[PDB]
Amino acid sequence: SIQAEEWYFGKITRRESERLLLNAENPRGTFLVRESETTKGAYCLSVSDFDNAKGLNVKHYKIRKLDSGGFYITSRTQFNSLQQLVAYYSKHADGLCHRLTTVCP
């Protein structure tokens, strides 16, 4: 289950995810998965980033789940579970601001 996952924060708002991710101790790629605020059945992958320009900041990526079974951010790259999606993005930055690194405290 998705609920079993420590990086799954469930029903928390976008603002709350930012409050948690904007901690100065967080390195790039600190992340969490939560429900989308407004898209029924969809999730959001919230990720911390850092650059000298913007400093510490947060990006949010919508994760879709098909009834047909797949989880994905881009339809071209789907996974059989949210867990597999997270494992993939921990190795590939692809189009994300950074590869996933550590679960948000």
Domains of the chain: 1-105 (3.30.505.10)
Please state the φ and ψ torsions of residue 87, each to the nearest 5 degrees: -60, -40
24, two tokens: 């100065």
Contacts of 20 (CB under 8 A, 6+ apart): 32, 104, 105
Distance from the first to the final alpha carbon of the chain? 21
Experimental approach was X-ray
Sheet containing strand 71-72, edge to edge, reads 8-10, 31-35, 43-51, 55-65, 71-72, 78-79
In angstroms, the Cα distances linking 69 to 5, 16, 43, 75 are: 19, 29, 14, 12
Nearest to 32 by CA among 11, 56, 1: 11
Query: Resolution for this model in angstroms, one decimal place?
Result: 1.6
- 10 has which bridge partners? 34
